[PDB]
Short mmCIF file of C-alpha atoms in Angstrom, two decimals:
data_model
loop_
_atom_site.label_atom_id
_atom_site.label_comp_id
_atom_site.label_asym_id
_atom_site.label_seq_id
_atom_site.Cartn_x
_atom_site.Cartn_y
_atom_site.Cartn_z
CA UNK A 1 -20.64 19.62 11.05
CA UNK A 2 -20.86 16.28 9.35
CA UNK A 3 -18.09 14.70 11.30
CA UNK A 4 -15.14 12.64 10.22
CA UNK A 5 -17.15 10.88 7.48
CA UNK A 6 -17.78 14.22 5.77
CA UNK A 7 -14.18 15.33 6.25
CA UNK A 8 -13.08 12.12 4.55
CA UNK A 9 -15.62 12.59 1.77
CA UNK A 10 -14.26 16.09 1.23
CA UNK A 11 -10.75 14.65 0.72
CA UNK A 12 -12.23 13.25 -2.51
CA UNK A 13 -9.72 13.04 -5.39
CA UNK A 14 -6.18 14.03 -4.52
CA UNK A 15 -2.59 13.87 -5.63
CA UNK A 16 0.75 13.56 -3.86
CA UNK A 17 3.41 16.22 -4.28
CA UNK A 18 6.07 13.51 -4.18
CA UNK A 19 9.84 13.45 -4.74
CA UNK A 20 9.84 16.80 -2.94
CA UNK A 21 9.72 17.56 0.82
CA UNK A 22 9.90 13.85 1.74
CA UNK A 23 13.45 13.64 0.33
CA UNK A 24 16.20 14.72 2.79
CA UNK A 25 15.68 18.25 1.40
CA UNK A 26 13.48 19.84 -1.21
CA UNK A 27 14.71 18.99 -4.69
CA UNK A 28 17.12 16.26 -3.55
CA UNK A 29 14.92 13.67 -5.34
CA UNK A 30 14.05 15.77 -8.39
CA UNK A 31 10.91 17.83 -7.65
CA UNK A 32 11.08 21.35 -6.27
CA UNK A 33 7.64 22.70 -5.44
CA UNK A 34 6.30 25.64 -7.45
CA UNK A 35 3.26 27.82 -6.80
CA UNK A 36 1.77 27.00 -10.19
CA UNK A 37 1.62 23.30 -9.32
CA UNK A 38 -1.20 23.96 -6.86
CA UNK A 39 -3.11 25.89 -9.54
CA UNK A 40 -2.64 23.14 -12.13
CA UNK A 41 -3.81 20.49 -9.63
CA UNK A 42 -6.88 22.56 -8.77
CA UNK A 43 -7.61 23.11 -12.47
CA UNK A 44 -7.26 19.41 -13.26
CA UNK A 45 -10.12 18.63 -10.88
CA UNK A 46 -8.32 17.34 -7.78
CA UNK A 47 -9.67 18.50 -4.43
CA UNK A 48 -6.69 17.56 -2.24
CA UNK A 49 -2.91 17.68 -2.04
CA UNK A 50 -1.13 15.10 0.04
CA UNK A 51 2.17 16.67 1.14
CA UNK A 52 4.73 14.06 2.16
CA UNK A 53 7.15 15.71 4.57
CA UNK A 54 10.22 14.05 6.03
CA UNK A 55 11.12 16.14 9.07
CA UNK A 56 14.02 14.26 10.66
CA UNK A 57 16.79 15.89 8.58
CA UNK A 58 15.32 19.30 9.53
CA UNK A 59 15.16 18.91 13.32
CA UNK A 60 17.72 19.11 16.09
CA UNK A 61 19.21 15.78 17.12
CA UNK A 62 19.15 16.87 20.76
CA UNK A 63 16.15 17.92 22.82
CA UNK A 64 13.94 19.85 22.27
CA UNK A 65 14.47 18.67 18.66
CA UNK A 66 13.45 21.99 17.16
CA UNK A 67 12.46 21.97 13.50
CA UNK A 68 14.37 24.35 11.17
CA UNK A 69 12.24 27.54 10.99
CA UNK A 70 13.03 27.92 7.27
CA UNK A 71 11.77 24.38 6.60
CA UNK A 72 8.69 24.98 8.73
CA UNK A 73 8.13 28.15 6.69
CA UNK A 74 8.25 26.12 3.47
CA UNK A 75 5.55 23.81 4.84
CA UNK A 76 3.58 26.95 5.89
CA UNK A 77 3.86 28.10 2.29
CA UNK A 78 2.53 24.80 0.89
CA UNK A 79 -0.40 24.88 3.32
CA UNK A 80 -1.14 28.46 2.21
CA UNK A 81 -0.97 27.72 -1.53
CA UNK A 82 -3.30 24.75 -1.14
CA UNK A 83 -5.80 26.62 1.01
CA UNK A 84 -5.81 29.70 -1.19
CA UNK A 85 -6.64 27.52 -4.16
CA UNK A 86 -9.54 25.88 -2.31
CA UNK A 87 -7.65 22.58 -1.89
CA UNK A 88 -7.39 20.36 1.15
CA UNK A 89 -3.91 19.46 2.34
CA UNK A 90 -2.69 16.42 4.27
CA UNK A 91 0.51 17.10 6.22
CA UNK A 92 2.26 13.93 7.35
CA UNK A 93 5.46 12.63 8.86
CA UNK A 94 6.76 10.58 5.94
CA UNK A 95 10.19 8.92 5.75
CA UNK A 96 11.82 8.49 9.16
CA UNK A 97 14.48 5.78 8.99
CA UNK A 98 15.51 6.22 12.63
CA UNK A 99 11.97 5.76 13.98
CA UNK A 100 11.22 2.67 11.91
CA UNK A 101 14.60 1.21 12.92
CA UNK A 102 14.14 1.89 16.65
CA UNK A 103 10.69 3.08 17.74
CA UNK A 104 11.50 3.17 21.46
CA UNK A 105 14.74 5.11 21.09
CA UNK A 106 13.34 7.65 18.60
CA UNK A 107 9.92 8.02 20.27
CA UNK A 108 10.63 11.23 22.19
CA UNK A 109 12.04 13.01 19.16
CA UNK A 110 9.10 11.89 16.98
CA UNK A 111 6.57 13.01 19.60
CA UNK A 112 8.29 16.38 19.91
CA UNK A 113 8.11 16.73 16.14
CA UNK A 114 4.37 16.02 16.25
CA UNK A 115 3.84 18.46 19.13
CA UNK A 116 5.59 21.19 17.12
CA UNK A 117 3.53 20.40 14.01
CA UNK A 118 0.21 20.19 15.88
CA UNK A 119 0.77 23.40 17.87
CA UNK A 120 1.91 25.26 14.77
CA UNK A 121 -1.17 24.33 12.69
CA UNK A 122 -3.68 24.20 15.58
CA UNK A 123 -5.83 27.02 14.16
CA UNK A 124 -5.89 25.87 10.54
CA UNK A 125 -9.37 25.12 9.13
CA UNK A 126 -10.83 21.65 8.57
CA UNK A 127 -9.24 21.53 5.13
CA UNK A 128 -5.89 20.77 6.84
CA UNK A 129 -5.44 17.12 7.86
CA UNK A 130 -2.70 15.42 9.90
CA UNK A 131 -1.23 12.00 9.03
CA UNK A 132 0.75 10.47 11.88
CA UNK A 133 3.28 8.22 10.11
CA UNK A 134 3.61 7.17 6.50
CA UNK A 135 4.03 3.42 5.93
CA UNK A 136 5.30 2.08 9.29
CA UNK A 137 7.84 -0.69 8.67
CA UNK A 138 11.05 -2.05 10.17
CA UNK A 139 10.48 -2.88 13.84
CA UNK A 140 6.82 -1.95 13.38
CA UNK A 141 6.54 -4.87 10.94
CA UNK A 142 8.11 -7.20 13.53
CA UNK A 143 5.77 -6.08 16.30
CA UNK A 144 2.65 -4.20 15.12
CA UNK A 145 1.73 -3.42 18.69
CA UNK A 146 4.71 -1.02 18.80
CA UNK A 147 2.89 1.04 16.17
CA UNK A 148 -0.48 0.68 17.91
CA UNK A 149 1.02 2.06 21.13
CA UNK A 150 3.02 4.79 19.42
CA UNK A 151 0.13 6.01 17.29
CA UNK A 152 -2.00 6.29 20.44
CA UNK A 153 0.70 8.38 22.13
CA UNK A 154 1.17 10.61 19.08
CA UNK A 155 -2.60 11.03 18.84
CA UNK A 156 -2.76 12.18 22.47
CA UNK A 157 0.00 14.71 21.75
CA UNK A 158 -1.88 16.01 18.69
CA UNK A 159 -5.19 16.19 20.57
CA UNK A 160 -3.61 18.34 23.30
CA UNK A 161 -3.80 21.22 20.78
CA UNK A 162 -6.05 19.94 17.93
CA UNK A 163 -8.97 18.39 19.84
CA UNK A 164 -10.94 17.41 16.72
CA UNK A 165 -8.82 17.71 13.53
CA UNK A 166 -9.00 14.74 11.19
CA UNK A 167 -6.00 12.45 11.83
CA UNK A 168 -5.05 9.82 9.25
CA UNK A 169 -3.64 6.52 10.52
CA UNK A 170 -2.64 3.36 8.70
CA UNK A 171 -1.45 -0.19 9.39
CA UNK A 172 2.09 -1.59 9.33
CA UNK A 173 3.55 -3.42 6.35
CA UNK A 174 4.06 -0.01 4.71
CA UNK A 175 0.35 0.81 5.15
CA UNK A 176 -0.67 -2.56 3.72
CA UNK A 177 -4.42 -3.21 3.74
CA UNK A 178 -3.59 -6.88 4.41
CA UNK A 179 -2.37 -5.88 7.89
CA UNK A 180 -5.45 -3.88 8.88
CA UNK A 181 -6.46 -6.66 11.27
CA UNK A 182 -3.32 -6.02 13.30
CA UNK A 183 -4.14 -2.31 13.58
CA UNK A 184 -5.68 -1.20 16.89
CA UNK A 185 -7.02 2.33 17.28
CA UNK A 186 -8.18 4.34 20.29
CA UNK A 187 -11.86 5.24 20.38
CA UNK A 188 -11.10 8.73 19.04
CA UNK A 189 -14.02 9.72 16.77
CA UNK A 190 -11.93 11.79 14.36
CA UNK A 191 -9.66 9.21 12.74
CA UNK A 192 -9.43 8.35 9.04
CA UNK A 193 -7.85 4.99 8.20
CA UNK A 194 -5.45 4.80 5.29
CA UNK A 195 -3.82 2.12 3.22
CA UNK A 196 -1.63 2.26 0.12
CA UNK A 197 -2.19 0.19 -3.00
CA UNK A 198 0.45 -1.06 -5.44
CA UNK A 199 -0.74 -4.62 -6.14
CA UNK A 200 0.52 -6.37 -8.19
CA UNK A 201 4.04 -5.20 -7.29
CA UNK A 202 5.52 -7.10 -10.25
CA UNK A 203 3.72 -4.56 -12.44
CA UNK A 204 3.58 -1.27 -10.50
CA UNK A 205 7.23 -1.39 -9.37
CA UNK A 206 8.76 -3.06 -12.42
CA UNK A 207 12.16 -1.62 -13.18
CA UNK A 208 12.36 0.00 -9.73
CA UNK A 209 15.96 1.25 -9.51
CA UNK A 210 15.69 1.62 -5.72
CA UNK A 211 15.69 -2.17 -5.28
CA UNK A 212 18.61 -4.57 -5.48
CA UNK A 213 18.23 -6.46 -7.75
CA UNK A 214 16.12 -4.30 -10.06
CA UNK A 215 12.88 -6.16 -10.92
CA UNK A 216 12.31 -7.04 -14.59
CA UNK A 217 10.35 -4.77 -16.92
CA UNK A 218 8.12 -5.55 -19.86
CA UNK A 219 5.36 -6.60 -17.44
CA UNK A 220 1.94 -5.85 -18.98
CA UNK A 221 -1.27 -5.24 -17.04
CA UNK A 222 -4.72 -6.14 -18.41
CA UNK A 223 -8.03 -6.65 -16.67
CA UNK A 224 -8.33 -10.21 -18.07
CA UNK A 225 -4.79 -11.37 -17.23
CA UNK A 226 -4.38 -14.22 -14.80
CA UNK A 227 -3.70 -13.32 -11.18
CA UNK A 228 -3.55 -14.84 -7.74
CA UNK A 229 -6.40 -14.07 -5.37
CA UNK A 230 -5.93 -10.69 -3.69
CA UNK A 231 -3.36 -10.59 -0.92
CA UNK A 232 -1.71 -13.91 -1.85
CA UNK A 233 1.88 -12.96 -2.69
CA UNK A 234 4.08 -15.16 -4.81
CA UNK A 235 6.88 -16.23 -2.45
CA UNK A 236 8.00 -19.07 -4.76
CA UNK A 237 11.66 -20.14 -4.76
CA UNK A 238 13.81 -22.07 -7.21
CA UNK A 239 10.99 -21.91 -9.76
CA UNK A 240 9.67 -20.08 -12.77
CA UNK A 241 6.07 -19.26 -11.87
CA UNK A 242 3.85 -17.27 -14.15
CA UNK A 243 0.58 -16.94 -16.01
CA UNK A 244 0.81 -17.49 -19.76
CA UNK A 245 -2.61 -16.75 -21.17
CA UNK A 246 -5.06 -18.60 -18.95
CA UNK A 247 -2.48 -21.00 -17.55
CA UNK A 248 -0.33 -20.88 -14.43
CA UNK A 249 2.97 -22.41 -15.52
CA UNK A 250 5.31 -23.85 -12.88
CA UNK A 251 8.88 -24.94 -13.70
CA UNK A 252 10.70 -26.37 -10.68
CA UNK A 253 14.26 -25.36 -11.63
CA UNK A 254 16.13 -27.11 -8.79
CA UNK A 255 15.71 -29.84 -6.22
CA UNK A 256 13.04 -29.13 -3.58
CA UNK A 257 11.89 -25.92 -5.32
CA UNK A 258 8.60 -24.52 -4.11
CA UNK A 259 5.45 -22.90 -5.46
CA UNK A 260 4.57 -20.69 -2.51
CA UNK A 261 1.69 -18.28 -1.87
CA UNK A 262 1.76 -16.16 1.29
CA UNK A 263 -0.94 -13.87 2.68
CA UNK A 264 -0.35 -11.28 5.41
CA UNK A 265 -4.08 -11.45 6.16
CA UNK A 266 -4.66 -15.21 5.94
CA UNK A 267 -8.02 -16.98 5.92
CA UNK A 268 -10.14 -19.07 8.27
CA UNK A 269 -12.97 -21.52 7.77
CA UNK A 270 -11.46 -23.90 5.20
CA UNK A 271 -10.63 -27.56 5.72
CA UNK A 272 -9.42 -28.77 2.28
CA UNK A 273 -7.11 -27.71 -0.56
CA UNK A 274 -8.03 -28.75 -4.09
CA UNK A 275 -5.75 -28.50 -7.10
CA UNK A 276 -5.24 -29.96 -10.52
CA UNK A 277 -2.12 -30.19 -12.67
CA UNK A 278 -1.72 -30.86 -16.38
CA UNK A 279 0.71 -33.75 -15.76
CA UNK A 280 1.22 -36.15 -12.84
CA UNK A 281 3.36 -34.22 -10.36
CA UNK A 282 4.96 -35.51 -7.18
CA UNK A 283 4.54 -32.84 -4.49
CA UNK A 284 5.06 -32.04 -0.85
CA UNK A 285 2.00 -30.03 0.23
CA UNK A 286 2.31 -27.67 3.19
CA UNK A 287 -0.19 -25.18 4.58
CA UNK A 288 1.68 -24.16 7.73
CA UNK A 289 5.30 -23.06 8.00
CA UNK A 290 7.65 -25.44 9.85
CA UNK A 291 4.87 -28.05 10.06
CA UNK A 292 5.15 -31.53 8.51
CA UNK A 293 4.28 -31.59 4.80
CA UNK A 294 2.15 -34.28 3.15
CA UNK A 295 3.47 -36.21 0.14
CA UNK A 296 0.97 -36.45 -2.72
CA UNK A 297 1.22 -37.40 -6.40
CA UNK A 298 -1.38 -36.00 -8.80
CA UNK A 299 -2.53 -37.32 -12.19
CA UNK A 300 -2.84 -35.18 -15.32
CA UNK A 301 -6.16 -33.34 -15.67
CA UNK A 302 -7.61 -34.92 -12.53
CA UNK A 303 -8.32 -32.98 -9.34
CA UNK A 304 -6.52 -33.87 -6.09
CA UNK A 305 -7.99 -32.82 -2.70
CA UNK A 306 -5.98 -32.65 0.55
CA UNK A 307 -7.32 -32.09 4.05
CA UNK A 308 -5.58 -29.10 5.65
CA UNK A 309 -5.37 -31.00 8.95
CA UNK A 310 -2.94 -33.39 7.26
CA UNK A 311 -0.45 -30.81 5.97
CA UNK A 312 0.12 -28.47 8.89
CA UNK A 313 -3.40 -28.06 10.27
CA UNK A 314 -3.37 -24.26 10.67
CA UNK A 315 -6.21 -22.28 12.17
CA UNK A 316 -5.35 -19.17 10.14
CA UNK A 317 -4.06 -20.25 6.73
CA UNK A 318 -1.31 -17.84 5.64
CA UNK A 319 1.21 -20.02 3.79
CA UNK A 320 0.48 -22.45 0.95
CA UNK A 321 3.29 -24.48 -0.62
CA UNK A 322 3.32 -27.05 -3.44
CA UNK A 323 6.94 -28.18 -3.28
CA UNK A 324 8.87 -30.22 -5.84
CA UNK A 325 9.15 -33.65 -4.14
CA UNK A 326 12.47 -34.40 -5.81
CA UNK A 327 16.20 -33.61 -5.52
CA UNK A 328 16.19 -32.66 -9.22
CA UNK A 329 14.49 -30.04 -11.38
CA UNK A 330 11.20 -30.98 -13.07
CA UNK A 331 9.72 -30.22 -16.48
CA UNK A 332 7.20 -27.36 -16.59
CA UNK A 333 3.56 -28.17 -15.93
CA UNK A 334 0.31 -26.21 -15.68
CA UNK A 335 -1.50 -25.70 -12.37
CA UNK A 336 -5.03 -25.61 -13.76
CA UNK A 337 -6.92 -25.25 -10.49
CA UNK A 338 -6.08 -24.22 -6.94
CA UNK A 339 -8.87 -23.58 -4.47
CA UNK A 340 -9.61 -23.84 -0.78
CA UNK A 341 -12.83 -25.53 0.33
CA UNK A 342 -14.85 -25.60 3.51
CA UNK A 343 -18.38 -25.65 4.92
CA UNK A 344 -19.03 -22.43 3.02
CA UNK A 345 -18.17 -21.05 -0.41
CA UNK A 346 -14.77 -21.93 -1.96
CA UNK A 347 -11.83 -19.56 -2.34
CA UNK A 348 -10.31 -19.70 -5.82
CA UNK A 349 -6.63 -18.79 -5.51
CA UNK A 350 -6.39 -18.30 -9.30
CA UNK A 351 -8.39 -15.40 -10.71
CA UNK A 352 -7.86 -12.41 -13.00
CA UNK A 353 -6.26 -9.04 -12.38
CA UNK A 354 -9.40 -6.86 -12.36
CA UNK A 355 -11.16 -9.18 -9.95
CA UNK A 356 -8.08 -9.13 -7.71
CA UNK A 357 -8.42 -5.36 -7.42
CA UNK A 358 -12.11 -5.69 -6.55
CA UNK A 359 -11.39 -8.40 -3.96
CA UNK A 360 -8.78 -6.21 -2.27
CA UNK A 361 -11.11 -3.23 -2.04
CA UNK A 362 -13.92 -5.48 -0.75
CA UNK A 363 -11.61 -6.77 1.99
CA UNK A 364 -10.64 -3.24 3.01
CA UNK A 365 -14.30 -2.14 2.94
CA UNK A 366 -15.36 -5.06 5.14
CA UNK A 367 -12.71 -4.03 7.68
CA UNK A 368 -13.76 -0.38 7.49
CA UNK A 369 -17.47 -1.15 7.87
CA UNK A 370 -16.90 -3.49 10.80
CA UNK A 371 -14.74 -0.93 12.56
CA UNK A 372 -16.90 2.03 11.43
CA UNK A 373 -13.98 4.05 10.07
CA UNK A 374 -13.73 6.06 6.84
CA UNK A 375 -11.03 5.13 4.33
CA UNK A 376 -8.48 7.31 2.49
CA UNK A 377 -6.17 5.48 0.02
CA UNK A 378 -3.22 7.79 0.39
CA UNK A 379 -0.96 6.39 -2.37
CA UNK A 380 -1.41 4.32 -5.51
CA UNK A 381 0.39 4.40 -8.84
CA UNK A 382 2.38 2.47 -11.46
CA UNK A 383 6.01 3.27 -12.23
CA UNK A 384 6.97 4.79 -15.60
CA UNK A 385 9.02 1.69 -16.51
CA UNK A 386 5.73 -0.01 -17.39
CA UNK A 387 4.18 0.63 -20.78
CA UNK A 388 1.76 3.54 -20.72
CA UNK A 389 -1.37 1.69 -21.88
CA UNK A 390 -0.94 -0.85 -19.08
CA UNK A 391 -0.39 1.95 -16.56
CA UNK A 392 -3.53 3.72 -17.78
CA UNK A 393 -5.56 0.50 -17.52
CA UNK A 394 -4.27 -0.30 -14.03
CA UNK A 395 -4.71 3.27 -12.76
CA UNK A 396 -8.28 3.57 -14.04
CA UNK A 397 -9.27 0.15 -12.71
CA UNK A 398 -7.92 1.05 -9.24
CA UNK A 399 -9.49 4.53 -9.14
CA UNK A 400 -12.82 3.02 -10.25
CA UNK A 401 -12.87 0.39 -7.50
CA UNK A 402 -11.81 2.99 -4.92
CA UNK A 403 -14.72 5.28 -5.78
CA UNK A 404 -17.18 2.41 -6.06
CA UNK A 405 -16.37 1.88 -2.37
CA UNK A 406 -16.45 5.58 -1.42
CA UNK A 407 -12.75 5.58 -0.54
CA UNK A 408 -11.15 8.98 -0.87
CA UNK A 409 -7.71 8.77 -2.45
CA UNK A 410 -4.47 10.48 -3.44
CA UNK A 411 -2.57 9.39 -6.54
CA UNK A 412 1.20 8.85 -6.37
CA UNK A 413 2.32 11.22 -7.77
CA UNK A 414 2.09 14.67 -9.39
CA UNK A 415 5.40 14.77 -11.32
CA UNK A 416 8.58 12.68 -11.81
CA UNK A 417 8.66 8.90 -12.02
CA UNK A 418 5.03 8.09 -11.18
CA UNK A 419 3.92 11.51 -12.40
CA UNK A 420 0.82 12.62 -14.28
CA UNK A 421 2.28 16.04 -15.18
CA UNK A 422 5.27 16.33 -17.52
CA UNK A 423 7.45 19.17 -16.25
CA UNK A 424 9.59 19.12 -19.42
CA UNK A 425 6.72 19.66 -21.85
CA UNK A 426 4.67 21.49 -19.19
CA UNK A 427 1.67 19.31 -20.05
CA UNK A 428 -0.53 16.74 -18.37
CA UNK A 429 0.11 13.13 -19.36
CA UNK A 430 -3.40 13.05 -20.71
CA UNK A 431 -4.52 9.36 -20.70
CA UNK A 432 -3.14 8.82 -17.18
CA UNK A 433 -4.81 11.97 -15.86
CA UNK A 434 -8.03 10.85 -17.54
CA UNK A 435 -7.69 7.49 -15.78
CA UNK A 436 -7.84 9.49 -12.53
CA UNK A 437 -10.33 12.27 -13.47
CA UNK A 438 -12.54 10.90 -16.29
#
């Protein structure tokens, strides 16, 4: 055949049947599967269903951890409805609180679950894909090597009965592309690498009721909006930090407040930090956590440059802090420029939203090309609390960059809160669907 590259290409455009079998039981989170869903998805031009399945509530707590035959039968049914409509289907292990909380303790039960799944579907055609663990987090975030070791063990279990089926594997940080460099894979030739994409979280998860506190809404997304460079998260504290038009406004609202960008990936090869403020600002500059900061005072409209060796001297720059050098709050100012400099080409930390999407997909593609692995972006979507035009813009921009890079993908999700199909009106949410299938 064509190998794993062709299997990934055949994944093509896909959609998640979410809020369904990955809840503790089907319908617990609002979506019960129906046969007509598969037909609608096929008719809308998707080639693939991703089927999130949380198995732990359906398996014995004691060895041999047998999965409920009725639940297994429901997964059988979904596999059948996909296949009979000419769709691919990705079967995963999705939510698994116990495993993320204690990988070592829960390992045997998880591996038994995978052995049951792999043996049960061993004779399915190449249109059926396995996905070892959705979004590893918890202890896996603390020690990524736990996930590297576990995924290798689970892969060996799967390969005992499925010697060549495509197996989808992602990094920790909830399948964050920024943690790809911590992922380590065995030399198995039939692996597809996955990441999920929700940047910027302030927009895609605005109004998320599952968080405490609930993030604010009314966040708009536009290609030309200001943004931080891809992968630099706003970890600021004690401050109002935000783009207003072309300007990054910083209000230090308390003593020692900090403007703080953090990257899970980090960067190498820079030796200086350059920035410019609209007013003279007295700062503590730090580019390495728990390292000594350097005191600097800028002047309005005039660039200041600081050698990284003098404010923490990191080898891999992951944390960048401009801290209010004062026990009191400070009036708002504009950060007009912020860029890293080195022997090579500078890194502008301030950019625009569209370019941030492109930068993220370029980073993933560089990883995938270096490691010679195909890429499937198994989840991306913007929550319904955002205004629809912004969601359409974001969704189409993301899908476009994905396909420009020949990433296969699966939108989150078919129905419910990220949904593209309105089950009440029994109609597609047309502009969002068109963002995915133009």
